[PDB]
Amino acid sequence: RSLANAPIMILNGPNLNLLGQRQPEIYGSDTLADVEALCVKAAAAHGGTVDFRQSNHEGELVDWIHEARLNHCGIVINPAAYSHTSVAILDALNTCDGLPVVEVHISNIHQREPFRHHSYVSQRADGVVAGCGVQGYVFGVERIAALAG
Amino acid sequence: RSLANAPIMILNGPNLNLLGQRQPEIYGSDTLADVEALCVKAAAAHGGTVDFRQSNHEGELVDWIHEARLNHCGIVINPAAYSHTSVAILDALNTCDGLPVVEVHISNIHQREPFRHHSYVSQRADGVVAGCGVQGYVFGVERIAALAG
Amino acid sequence: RSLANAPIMILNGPNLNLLGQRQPEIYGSDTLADVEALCVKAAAAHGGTVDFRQSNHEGELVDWIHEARLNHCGIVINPAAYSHTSVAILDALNTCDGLPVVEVHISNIHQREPFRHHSYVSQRADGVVAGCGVQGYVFGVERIAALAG
Amino acid sequence: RSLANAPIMILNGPNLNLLGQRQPEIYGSDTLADVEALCVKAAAAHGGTVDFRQSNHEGELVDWIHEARLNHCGIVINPAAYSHTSVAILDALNTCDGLPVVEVHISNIHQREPFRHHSYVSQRADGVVAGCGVQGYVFGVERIAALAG
Amino acid sequence: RSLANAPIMILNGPNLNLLGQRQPEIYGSDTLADVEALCVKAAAAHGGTVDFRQSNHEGELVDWIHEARLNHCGIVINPAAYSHTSVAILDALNTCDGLPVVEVHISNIHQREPFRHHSYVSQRADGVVAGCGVQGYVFGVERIAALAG
Amino acid sequence: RSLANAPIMILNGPNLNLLGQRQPEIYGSDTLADVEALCVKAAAAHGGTVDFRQSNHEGELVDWIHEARLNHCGIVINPAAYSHTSVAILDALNTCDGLPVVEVHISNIHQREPFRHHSYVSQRADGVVAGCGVQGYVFGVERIAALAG
Amino acid sequence: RSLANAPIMILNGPNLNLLGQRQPEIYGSDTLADVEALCVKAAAAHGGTVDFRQSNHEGELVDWIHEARLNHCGIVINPAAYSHTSVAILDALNTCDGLPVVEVHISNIHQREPFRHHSYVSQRADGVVAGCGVQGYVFGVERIAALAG
Amino acid sequence: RSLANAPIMILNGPNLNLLGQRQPEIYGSDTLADVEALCVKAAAAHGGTVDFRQSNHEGELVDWIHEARLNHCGIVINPAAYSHTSVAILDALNTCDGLPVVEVHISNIHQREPFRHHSYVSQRADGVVAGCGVQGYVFGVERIAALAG
Amino acid sequence: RSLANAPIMILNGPNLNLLGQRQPEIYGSDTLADVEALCVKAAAAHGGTVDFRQSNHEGELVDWIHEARLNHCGIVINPAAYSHTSVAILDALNTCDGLPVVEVHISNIHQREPFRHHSYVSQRADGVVAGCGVQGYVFGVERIAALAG
Amino acid sequence: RSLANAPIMILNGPNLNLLGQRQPEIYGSDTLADVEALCVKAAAAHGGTVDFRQSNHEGELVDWIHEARLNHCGIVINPAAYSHTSVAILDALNTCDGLPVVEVHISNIHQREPFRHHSYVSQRADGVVAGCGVQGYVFGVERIAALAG
Amino acid sequence: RSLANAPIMILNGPNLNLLGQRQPEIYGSDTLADVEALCVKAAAAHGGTVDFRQSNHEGELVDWIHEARLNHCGIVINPAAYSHTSVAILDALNTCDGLPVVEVHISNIHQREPFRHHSYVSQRADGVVAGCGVQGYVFGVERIAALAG
Amino acid sequence: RSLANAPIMILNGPNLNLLGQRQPEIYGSDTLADVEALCVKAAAAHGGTVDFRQSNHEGELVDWIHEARLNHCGIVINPAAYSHTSVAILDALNTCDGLPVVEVHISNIHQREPFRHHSYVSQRADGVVAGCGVQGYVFGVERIAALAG
Ligand SMILES: O=C(O)[C@]1(O)C=C[C@@H](O)[C@H](O)C1
Ligand SMILES: O=C(O)[C@]1(O)C=C[C@@H](O)[C@H](O)C1
Ligand SMILES: O=C(O)[C@]1(O)C=C[C@@H](O)[C@H](O)C1
Ligand SMILES: O=C(O)[C@]1(O)C=C[C@@H](O)[C@H](O)C1
Ligand SMILES: O=C(O)[C@]1(O)C=C[C@@H](O)[C@H](O)C1
Ligand SMILES: O=C(O)[C@]1(O)C=C[C@@H](O)[C@H](O)C1
Ligand SMILES: O=C(O)[C@]1(O)C=C[C@@H](O)[C@H](O)C1
Ligand SMILES: O=C(O)[C@]1(O)C=C[C@@H](O)[C@H](O)C1
Ligand SMILES: O=C(O)[C@]1(O)C=C[C@@H](O)[C@H](O)C1
Ligand SMILES: O=C(O)[C@]1(O)C=C[C@@H](O)[C@H](O)C1
Ligand SMILES: O=C(O)[C@]1(O)C=C[C@@H](O)[C@H](O)C1
Ligand SMILES: O=C(O)[C@]1(O)C=C[C@@H](O)[C@H](O)C1
């Protein structure tokens, strides 16, 4: 699907419901609603739209990726803690044959604890953006626009 | 229990709802409905029945293992990605004292990525069948029939 | 918050709904209701109350931790299998800046399988009690009382 | 070949000559002759025949695999201890381009010592059956019949 | 032995003679004599007594464990650095067949350097309390009281 | 320094002089000169300029990072093979106290050989962009512009 | 069986046919025939006899172990290189339920290459003698005599 | 010994009897007989002769190395799978004090599976040639000629 | 020195003072005094004498090794837990240039916990006897007698 | 290119300028001039020529590999220390699509320190010759000649 | 403290009482008394004094560190074998907040056995001198004088 | 060469040209020029001279080591980041047969990131001084003076 014909699915993993409420040095002071607005504006500049969601549930994220597979033009995902533990989310992303996928981490996971160094999502994501703050979601949208083009 | 007195529980993990829709070289062209019909027929030859289910949710699979512990004669389980990550499912199976359990993988996990080589489920499953296609489910039913009898 | 102003959240992870129904040599013969009663009693000695819950779902435990963050004076948590697998639970506890957290394991995980030796929760928990039986939940409450103090 | 045109080679590795003479809790009370008879019946149900053999010598197994490559319709193999050590037997099975191969372990190797967890044969075998008892030999014959078919 | 018939042995390993003289953020401001008084009071509520000792010598701790084996109703032990290095103290505790043993760490060793994450003492200790401050020694006395009971 | 007062230094490591001349599936069909033009255009949208360079020499990259430290407003660096081996380039970037640094990889290193999975540069780079193709350089420029502001 | 009733099987692995022909600093200057005569004498002192053998073939050693299992009073084995590689020989010795088995190495394998530090045979052997030269074989016989008694 | 007084022993390990019958991309289209003819021609240019053998049995290869130790001027060996598993063959080559030994792999083992990266044989072989095709056997012969002369 | 001119030092590490009091399946039912008497008899058959000692202190063992270096004809040592942890004792034994040293373990340390598999003493000991019960001390004395001769 | 149309590039890494001035037991007594002459002679026998060079600089070797890519018929490379450290040299060789490359080590790196066992160049080199002395360069030229044919 | 007000504590670990009596190639021919006189002179050149001690006992070293913490101006310590094993000595040095500590090894531990490569002491020592012979004790005194100054 | 006949070569690795310009807590406030003057003064006390150099290029350091080999009386080297990555510098130092070499690190690399813990240079350096500040260079000069004289 193109940007004109279907929304970009923007998915957020566990604990990102609290974004902006603490740890500004690591995660910044923008809320998840602030991130949604950034994505909406970036996508509008390419004539597309976004379907922005957040869950603390691994299986719900799996269900949402299956929905994106059929109805969306691409996926921008910040898997949060599930990046490091979820083979199930990797496997769900592997069912999206041909769909542009971009993984985003607000923080630079490579400077953090060793358990954050590996991401199962990175094995499938086309592109991976880390440590570029909430600006990394706008890079994600930009990349999806380039790949759907 | 016996096969005459209670159904065999057949559980399927995440992403298996899309079985048959892609990657036929790895997973075959049969759907989960097709697999259920194979199971039904196998169990009927021993005078039993099957209770066939699929979920993307780790805790729901744990709930359904607890249900089987009280109401079913055995468990045939393809845990899918949770095979490799879920201690919780292993611990649910460990509560099934004396209940026959057979783990099934459609694909030969030993030939795939190194993160697929280890299964927590194998530490409790009585028997483990891998790489026998969807025919592996039928072996699971036949093994349960032999262990219940 | 103080114990006088808000309850202590007591959280139990997967399979603990079956406590007391098997494996008494490892887990004892007390049920979760019995454990709840021990907690209520220990908190009442400090003029406090408890909010005792159990779930098999990782995401639900995350949600409950966010709830505690806002409404409770501390968290006593037995993460069960999720101790060993959940970065998501650890990141949920990390959002509880300044809240006392005590991790409890009924069994001595250090004598058990190697996959049980590490817990993600222990990186954030203030205190960790293992192998003191259900009495460890009483120690948990006492520790929360001292810390809220 | 088809089952009608050539026998299924069934190969057994070291120490399996003593099957049934000890450790019934691990290996059962059936002898290797008993297993051969189970196999003859199982193949007969599909119109086929078996060529059942046992050796304690790695090189002899290698030679029999080369023989099977030219004269048999498939290989069912219980490599026994050589499962864990023999690159040479893996390399012999790799020469059997297009020939169905099924690996069988009576015992659930995944519950045993860590040196039994890895099998070189599993990298080539189409299907691997473990912990289904001597019934796993019947499953192997069934899977060869399905693949040859 | 019951608490009424014999003292509880409380053993402290190297450098704990300086407890409370520095690093209050990790170890607190209480001295070892303050700890002994906390223990004396906890045991007296159960009609017991304590024999509280500290040594910088691995061998002397072994010697004291052999003494407790014959004359004491349980052992509460903070092995300090020897937790991480002493097979000899583990072996000594192993000789105390049926004697209740609780290991205590004032600090949460799981949040510290990786060499502190493993304890040889935890392989035999019935229960292990870490990161509950000096209050952990009171938990130890209470657990010994319950086990001796 | 601000974008208006000093150029962004854009450094490229070994073998990138051949970009576009082969392996288009991994690295694309754009040349390094094409990449420079993308960078020039992106910086000019923010009123800035770029100083674009390429070297096969680890010690020359070090020199250029020292130059940037004193004269440039930020660094966008694709260290190429030196990402995986160069502690010297990491230490050079560590001397750039307060300067924004963004690391770029054309390819998704996480999907490639395991020796490409670790980057020493990632330990200092504020942000890391991988597998966004040559568009990642534009993301780099955009992130420097945001951080210099 | 007793020593009076049946011989002690003395088995030697690969390359020991050349004992005494080189490397006297590691293996001594006695030949295998000289070792056999030492064994014959030691067994004669206890009213017993020996059946002394050497082979370069793993399978042959397995066959000889199965023979000893039925016809001999114990096994003294120097498995030579197969000590480090042969799961098959370990599994053969495991069939010898109740039979005394002593493993002998002329050299001190623990001072040699790291690949010599682990022996599969040591997992079953009752006793293991290393670095005692050919005199170790005499100790082997004496231990068998004590265990058969 | 010189090439004029004794033959060069050329030894081939398991599965090499099928050389040229499959996998030409890895092993080429020449058969083992073709390889022997190349070696005969190379040795004849130096006035020597070859004694060319192949075996699937580890112990037979050990036996032939002992034979070469007394009767041959050097050994060119392609140990095939035994390269990766056989301490026994390493130990047999170690008995050939002063005899030139060259190890040959047709394929480039370093580009293949990780289990093929290590060779026990390489610890004793004077020279090791890998990935030069069947031409590596000719190199082997030429190096023996230089070492013996 | 010779056996006629100076005693054999027989040293025992921690917890061996309790030998025979428990765990007869692992350590036998003989006491340390019984072992000493065995040693006295074995040395006397060679015209020698023994100096038998036990300590729980690593430093004391070190001191006794220095004493043996100047006054005794050899050392038989069961380092007990210090086998696994004491570089100091290894370093003490390394000062005994030319003195025969035999390490003894009553139990077969290779069948036990992995932390018992490695001994620092085995690096210097001439001979190492394990799993031969208290009879291994007699083998130690005999080996010292042979080496002193 | 063919050998008649373009020279064979022979590259030598760091410290090889001192070849023959020391360590003759490892490296021999031939100088680099001697090696060059060997190469010239071997190439001339195939109607070819050589371009023989040495550098201590990783980046200069990269540059020379790029030159060869365009102007030479193949590369014989002894990367010396860079063999073990240089991803940049491997990636330069990876740009030589279709060009024959042979890696040469004078010494048998497999018998030396463990840090010399792995070579990054071996991942791309067609053939790898180790331990055949300076004669290995002659084999390298011969292999280039066969591959260019 | 200053050098004028208190002596520099110079501590030596196990086996250094025999310094100079053997292994001169590793440890030199100076005795520990010789080293003490070198230290007295080096300290006198700065107007200071030394308190030089040696012990084979880990806990005595800990006791002496605690003494130094209160009464000395610095510590120069050669922990000998305890450098690699003692967390306890590391913890005692950690109690010396603000006191200059320099670790000295006579030998170059980095050229020796891998178990000597790591030192727990080096985590707290300000400076670490290795392989400079007994002259390293003079460097240690010199550094304490500079830090105290 | 003696200190009277030839200068001491003092080599400095990458980034040390910025010494004193930042990170005084780790590296001090002295510049490289200040360090050179300390060296010149230390050497002059022994009647010697220094040749002090710094480079960011690995091959230039190799070249300067080859120069020292022929013209200088020893090497004092702070390899900076190359300590951790350069097998080439180790190999250059290994050509300096009989020349005294002292490695110096201003910082205590053992307290820093794990990648700084290993130094290839330490395998060849006679002595290694770490964490003694710039004074470590003076100890280097003194050690060279003692070894040369
Ligand atoms: O946005 C992130 O930086 C992160 O993805 C979010 C949550 C964490 O759990 C990840 O480690 C990082
Ligand atoms: O059926 C299988 O082969 C598998 O269980 C299904 C999904 C994957 O996640 C498992 O790795 C394999
Ligand atoms: O209470 C416990 O001991 C435990 O937390 C509960 C369940 C298991 O999964 C944990 O490993 C232990
Ligand atoms: O059938 C089996 O279970 C096994 O294959 C037989 C022998 C053992 O050596 C294997 O580990 C398992
Ligand atoms: O009490 C503690 O927290 C500890 O046991 C004491 C000293 C340290 O050596 C231990 O690591 C922790
Ligand atoms: O742009 C890249 O993808 C890369 O940085 C370039 C060259 C390689 O050496 C890196 O691995 C990746
Ligand atoms: O007797 C020995 O010392 C040994 O068993 C014989 C041959 C080697 O292969 C073993 O490693 C040691
Ligand atoms: O010739 C070879 O390339 C090889 O030696 C032969 C067979 C394999 O088993 C080796 O791994 C490679
Ligand atoms: O005699 C033994 O078997 C042992 O040496 C004694 C005590 C233990 O600590 C050792 O592991 C074994
Ligand atoms: O030719 C060699 O043997 C080598 O390539 C040269 C220098 C060393 O650095 C290599 O390890 C080996
Ligand atoms: O001074 C030394 O070099 C050493 O500290 C002394 C004894 C050994 O145990 C250490 O490893 C090194
Ligand atoms: O002087 C030092 O401490 C160091 O050598 C200099 C730079 C770093 O790269 C080293 O790790 C340390």
Resolution (Å) of this entry = 1.8
Nearest to G110 among I128, I131, I143 (CB): I128
Query: Measured from the CB, is residue D86 less than 6 Å from ligand 4?
Result: no
Q: Which residues of I touch K (CB under 8 A)?
A: 57-60, 62-63, 66, 85-88, 90-92, 95, 97, 120
Q: Ligand 7 atom closest to Cα of G79?
A: 5
Contact B104, B140 (CB under 8 A): yes
DSSP 8-state secondary structure symbol assigned to residue L13: -
Chain F residues in contact with A128 (beta carbon < 8 A): 108, 110, 128-131
| Per-residue 3-state assignment (H helix, E strand, C coil) for chain G | CCCCCCCEEEEECCCHHHCCCCCHHHHCCCCHHHHHHHHHHHHHHCCCCEEEEECCCHHHHHHHHHHHHHHCCCEEEECCCHHHHCHHHHHHHHCCCCCCEEEEECCCHHHCCHHHCCCCHHHCCCEEEECCCCHHHHHHHHHHHHHHC
First to last CA, chain F: 10
Distance CA K146, CA K128 (A): 15
Q: Which ligand is nearest to the CA of C89?
A: 1
Q: Ligand 12 atom closest to Cα of L15?
A: 7
> Do the chains contact at E111 and C132, CB–CB below 8 Å?
no
Nearest to L62 among J56, J84, J85 (CB): J56
* Nearest chain J alpha carbon to F20: J95
Using a threshold of 3 CB pairs under 8 A, tell whether chains G and D touch: yes
Burial class (CB in 10 A: 0-12, 13-18, 19+), I33: exposed
Nearest residue (CA) to ligand 9, atom 7: I80
Q: In the annotation, is K27 catalytic? A: yes
What is the H or E stretch that residue D127 is in? strand D127-130
CA angle (J108 as vertex; J102, J109 as ends), nearest 5? 85
What amino acid positions of H are annotated as catalytic residues? Answer: 27, 105
Q: Which ligand is nearest to the CA of A81?
A: 1
Q: Residue L37 to residues B90, L19, L134: CA-CA distances in angstroms?
A: 68, 14, 11
The CATH number assigned to the domain holding A117 equals: 3.40.50.9100
H62's CB contacts (< 8 A; 6+ apart) are G14, G15, G56, H88, H89, H91, H92
Using the structure block, give the residue that is written with the tokens 């390889």: H35
Task: Give the pocket of ligand 10 (CB within 6 Å).
Answer: J 78, 80-81, 83, 105-107, 109, 116; L 91
Chain E residues in contact with I59 (beta carbon < 8 A): 59
Q: What are the contacts of B33-42 at 24+ separation with CB within 8 A?
A: B34/B134, B35/B134, B35/B137, B36/B10, B38/B134, B38/B135, B38/B137, B38/B138, B39/B8, B39/B10, B39/B76, B39/B137, B39/B138, B39/B141, B42/B137, B42/B138, B42/B141, B42/B142
Domain of H94? 1-149
Burial class (CB in 10 A: 0-12, 13-18, 19+), K2: exposed
Chain A residues in contact with C91 (beta carbon < 8 A): 14-15, 80-81
Domain count, chain K: 1
No. of helices (H) and no. of strands (E), chain B: 6, 5
Q: Which ligand is nearest to the CA of C35?
A: 3
Among L62, L86, L87, L124, residue to substitute to test ligand 10 (most atoms within 8 Å of Cβ): L87
Q: How many CA atoms lie within 13 A of G48 on its CB side?
A: 29
* Nearest chain G alpha carbon to I119: G110
* Nearest chain I alpha carbon to K58: I59
Distance CA H118, CA H105 (A): 12
Q: Which of B38, J43, C87, I1 is nearest to A79 (CA)?
A: C87
Query: SS3 for C84?
Result: helix
**Experimental method of this PDB entry:** X-ray
Contact D81, G58 (CB under 8 A): no
Nearest residue (CA) to ligand 12, atom 10: L80
* Structure token pair of residue A115: 């358990």
Query: Measured from the CB, is residue H109 less than 6 Å from ligand 8?
Result: yes
Using a threshold of 3 CB pairs under 8 A, tell whether chains A and C touch: yes
E132's CB contacts (< 8 A; 6+ apart) are C102, C126, C127, C129, C139, C143, E106, E139
Query: Measured from the CB, is residue G136 less than 6 Å from ligand 7?
Result: no
> Do the chains contact at B80 and A88, CB–CB below 8 Å?
yes
Q: Where are the beta strands (DSSP E) in H5-108?
A: 8-12, 50-54, 74-78, 101-105
Distance CA E80, CA E86 (A): 10
First to last CA, chain I: 9
Binding residues of C for substrate: 78, 84, 91, 106-107, 116
CA of residue D95 to ligand 8 center, whole Å = 13
Q: What are the contacts of D63-69 at 24+ separation with CB within 8 A?
A: D63/H56, D64/D9, D64/D11, D65/D9, D65/D11, D65/D89, D65/D92, D65/D93, D65/D95, D65/D96, D66/D92, D66/D95, D66/H15, D66/H17, D66/H18, D67/D9, D68/D9, D68/D11, D68/D96, D68/D99, D69/D95, D69/D96, D69/D99
Nearest to F95 among L18, L57, L85 (CB): L18
B68's CB contacts (< 8 A; 6+ apart) are B9, B11, B74, B75, B96, B99
* Structure token pair of residue E139: 């938990």
What amino acid positions of F are annotated as catalytic residues? Answer: 27, 105
Indicate the residue type of A132.
C
DSSP K18-80: GTTSS-HHHH-S--HHHHHHHHHHHHHTTT--EEEEE-S-HHHHHHHHHHHHHH-S-EEEE-T
Q: Which of F97, F1, F101 is nearest to F49 (CA)?
A: F1
CA dihedral J126, J128, J133, J139 (to 10 degrees): -30
Using the structure block, give the residue that is written with the tokens 């360590």: J23
Q: Is E143 annotated as a binding residue?
A: no
Query: Measured from the CB, is residue E83 less than 6 Å from ligand 5?
Result: yes
Are β-strands L127-130 and K127-130 bridged in parallel, bridged antiparallel, or unpaired? antiparallel
Distance CA D139, CA H70 (A): 52
Helix ranges restricted to H, L16-126? 24-27, 32-45, 58-71, 82-85, 87-94
